[PDB]
Design an enzyme around this catalytic site. Structure first.
Site, mmCIF file in Angstrom:
data_model
loop_
_atom_site.group_PDB
_atom_site.id
_atom_site.type_symbol
_atom_site.label_atom_id
_atom_site.label_comp_id
_atom_site.label_asym_id
_atom_site.label_seq_id
_atom_site.Cartn_x
_atom_site.Cartn_y
_atom_site.Cartn_z
ATOM 1 N N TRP A 1 0.908 -1.114 0.025
ATOM 2 C CA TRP A 1 0.017 0.023 -0.033
ATOM 3 C C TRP A 1 1.060 1.161 0.042
ATOM 4 O O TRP A 1 1.797 1.415 0.946
ATOM 5 C CB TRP A 1 -0.901 -0.010 1.210
ATOM 6 C CG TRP A 1 -2.037 -0.886 1.242
ATOM 7 C CD1 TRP A 1 -2.310 -1.958 0.329
ATOM 8 C CD2 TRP A 1 -3.204 -0.848 2.149
ATOM 9 N NE1 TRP A 1 -3.517 -2.490 0.472
ATOM 10 C CE2 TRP A 1 -4.078 -2.045 1.570
ATOM 11 C CE3 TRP A 1 -3.393 -0.295 3.344
ATOM 12 C CZ2 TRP A 1 -5.242 -2.432 2.422
ATOM 13 C CZ3 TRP A 1 -4.785 -0.742 4.042
ATOM 14 C CH2 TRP A 1 -5.549 -1.618 3.515
ATOM 15 N N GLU A 2 0.898 1.836 -1.261
ATOM 16 C CA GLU A 2 1.907 3.055 -1.382
ATOM 17 C C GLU A 2 1.339 4.303 -1.683
ATOM 18 O O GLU A 2 2.090 5.318 -1.822
ATOM 19 C CB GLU A 2 3.194 2.547 -2.355
ATOM 20 C CG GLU A 2 4.036 1.535 -1.811
ATOM 21 C CD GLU A 2 5.062 1.028 -2.978
ATOM 22 O OE1 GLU A 2 5.665 2.017 -3.685
ATOM 23 O OE2 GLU A 2 4.950 -0.100 -3.453
#
Ligand SMILES: *[C@@H]1O[C@H](CO)[C@@H](O[C@@H]2O[C@H](CO)[C@@H](O[C@@H]3O[C@H](CO[C@H]4O[C@H](CO)[C@@H](O)[C@H](O[C@H]5O[C@H](CO)[C@@H](O)[C@H](O)[C@@H]5O)[C@@H]4O)[C@@H](O)[C@H](O[C@H]4O[C@H](CO)[C@@H](O)[C@H](O)[C@@H]4O)[C@@H]3O)[C@H](O)[C@H]2NC(C)=O)[C@H](O)[C@H]1NC(C)=O
Ligand SMILES: *[C@@H]1O[C@H](CO)[C@@H](O[C@@H]2O[C@H](CO)[C@@H](O)[C@H](O)[C@H]2NC(C)=O)[C@H](O)[C@H]1NC(C)=O
Length: 417
Positions: free
Chosen positions: A111-112
């Protein structure tokens, strides 16, 4: 909280080759030797194995983000999305991706988009702040600026935390043996390479913001900090300080969260980040070697699709593997194992003494020889750990015992076992 010893038998330091070298072979006929690694995990996700699952952001529930032109997906922001719908899909996503209930491999969530700490959503991530402010401003149109800010900050951080903690918690509820954690956490933000006084130390209130993520560390069953080396590091003497402090920060938050045993597995590349410039042997020591010497549980070697795309690229990787990378992997893996056996009774990891801040776990070329077996079996190791090699380990290294074994030398099982 964590009870794993070595993640694989006889592997205080484990390596995962996270590369599509399968493509090099199938597309281009280039056969990269990957036998030196403990795990090969195709980022193309060709098979579902016991050692690694990755969830890219479109694969685990309903991850909210903004496209690069600013359009919302699943609401853009966690406070503008349904957690309940996310958790429903997450539950079903985990069961399909991880069919064995006792799965005990890496479970990496990637999750960036937004960061859980409001303070860290800067540069291209400042859209998450702008849009957080917008959302409360539309719901309460007659509201002054420092009032939408504080309400936006609390709503965002509140939501970001519910989503990340709830996803990790559900992952562990369903697969309690998975080494669940988010890619790239913690980040030390020590990118201040151009500054006279560069120590690699995590700046100012960075550590302080990471302490505010204790909830995150508590919900994690491994940590996956990134030690990708920016292009600007190439040809300076700052790589080792940069890596050292990024790995140290992962141990620091683990210890403060009441889990000194949390496996730490940094993500590394064999190129400078965003480039096709291979890391000199040097820089391998400063990165993978550095991680092992701090007692990392292993490293994930991520190779971008950009680097395995062509025949030329694939062939340069093949040759880098043979001349540089593969012998290095065997070298660091064996140094870590031999030290564990000689110093820590086979029941802990060797970890630098603080009097020796740059010591590494490597094999003496006078004691050992690493060589390619003719025709091309895997790399063999010949020779033996000398009594002088062992004496050098005793001076450079101490032990961090596997859970259940007692300090200082991990010889006897601990008290409450
Ligand atoms: C296991 O893995 C590690 C791989 O990292 C291997 O050890 C490394 O080997 C390389 C290449 O053989 C070494 O690189 C050379 O380093 C010298 C500088 O050496 C001095 O400084 C080092 C730290 O600053 C220090 O570690 C050195 O001490 C060891 O090394 C020598 C052997 O070189 C040995 O006699 C000692 O007893 C120690 O074991 C030493 O004080 C540098 O001058 C070299 O120059 C090369 O590159 C330049 C380009 O600028 C070129 O101009 C040169 O002519 C030359 O090609 C070179 O970089 C490295 O120091 C080793 N690292 C460590 C930490 O030991 C080890 O060999 C592997 N073992 C097995 C079994 O294969
Ligand atoms: C909050 O989430 C809603 C979705 O529920 C977003 O509204 C959508 O916005 C896009 C583009 O602006 C439209 O094409 C859709 O019709 C909207 N969907 C619905 C059903 O309302 C909204 O933009 C989000 N707000 C913020 C600040 O990001």
């Amino acid at each position: 909280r964590s009870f794993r010893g070595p993640l694989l038998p006889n592997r205080p330091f484990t390596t995962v080759w996270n590369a599509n070298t399968q493509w090099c072979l199938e597309r281009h006929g280039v056969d990269v030797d990957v036998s030196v690694f403990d795990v090969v995990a195709n980022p193309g996700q060709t098979f579902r194995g016991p050692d690694m699952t990755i969830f890219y952001s479109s694969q685990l529930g309903t991850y909210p983000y903004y496209t690069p032109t600013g359009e919302p997906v699943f609401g853009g922001l966690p406070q503008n999305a349904s957690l309940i719908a996310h958790l429903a899909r997450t539950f079903q996503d985990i069961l399909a991706a991880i069919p064995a209930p006792d799965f005990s491999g890496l479970a990496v969530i990637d999750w960036e988009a937004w960061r859980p700490r409001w303070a860290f959503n800067w540069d291209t991530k400042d859209i998450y702040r702008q849009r957080s402010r917008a959302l409360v401003q539309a719901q309460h149109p007659d509201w002054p600026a420092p009032q939408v800010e504080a309400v936006a900050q609390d709503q965002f951080q509140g939501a970001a935390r519910a989503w990340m903690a709830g996803t990790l918690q559900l992952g562990r509820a369903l697969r309690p043996r998975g080494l669940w954690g988010f890619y790239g956490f913690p980040d030390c933000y020590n990118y201040d390479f151009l500054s006279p006084n560069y120590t690699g130390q995590c700046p100012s209130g960075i550590r302080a913001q990471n302490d505010q993520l204790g909830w995150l560390w508590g919900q994690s069953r491994a940590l996956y900090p990134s030690i990708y080396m920016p292009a600007v590091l190439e040809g300076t003497g700052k790589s080792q300080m940069y890596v050292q402090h990024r790995v140290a920060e992962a141990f620091r938050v683990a210890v403060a969260a009441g889990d000194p045993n949390l496996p730490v597995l940094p993500y590394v590349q064999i190129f400078y980040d965003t480039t096709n410039h291979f890391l000199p042997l040097d820089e391998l020591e400063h990165s993978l070697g550095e991680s092992a010497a701090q007692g990392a549980a292993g490293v994930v070697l991520w190779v971008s699709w950009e680097n395995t795309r062509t025949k030329e690229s694939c062939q340069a990787i093949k040759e880098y593997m043979d001349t540089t990378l593969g012998p290095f992997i065997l070298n660091v893996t064996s140094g870590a194992l031999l030290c564990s056996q000689a110093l820590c009774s086979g029941h802990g990891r060797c970890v630098r003494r603080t009097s020796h801040p740059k010591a590494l776990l490597l094999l003496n070329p006078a004691s050992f020889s690493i060589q390619l077996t003719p025709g091309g079996g895997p790399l063999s190791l010949r020779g033996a750990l000398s009594l002088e090699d062992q004496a050098q380990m005793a001076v450079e290294f101490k032990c961090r015992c596997y859970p259940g074994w007692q300090a200082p030398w991990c010889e006897r099982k601990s008290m409450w076992t």
